[PDB]
């Protein structure tokens, strides 16, 4: 099929990886007590 | 202690699912042409 011209590459730089993992881990550390209850 | 028996899987997936999303995106960024 003729290719779609709307396609774009996606990026996540290393700093964003680190920031994101921190958010997720800290949210998990915060919410985990409530999930266990 | 009488904890919620779903707390373990809830916590594990809460960490793993978004962490994995980020690692996938990071690694495929690195592998793009310099």
């Amino acid at each position: 099929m003729e290719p779609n011209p709307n396609r774009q590459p996606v990026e996540l730089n290393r700093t964003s990886l680190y920031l994101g993992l921190l958010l997720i881990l800290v949210l998990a550390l915060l919410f985990s007590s409530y999930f266990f209850n | 202690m009488e904890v919620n028996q779903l707390g373990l899987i809830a916590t594990a997936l809460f960490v793993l699912v978004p962490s994995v999303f980020l690692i996938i995106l990071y690694v495929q960024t690195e592998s793009q042409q310099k």
């Binding site: 993992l21 881990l25 550390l29 985990s32 266990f36 | 904890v3 960490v15």
Partner: peptide, 30 residues
């Protein structure tokens, strides 16, 4: 199992600190 979970998340965060500091993308003046 709860204690393991809490300590595991904490340990991941500490490892993350190590990588974020010593294995950061270096800042470069263009």
């Amino acid at each position: 199992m709860e204690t393991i979970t809490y300590v595991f998340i904490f340990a991941c965060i500490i490892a993350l600190f190590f990588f974020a500091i010593f294995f950061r993308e270096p800042p470069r003046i263009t």
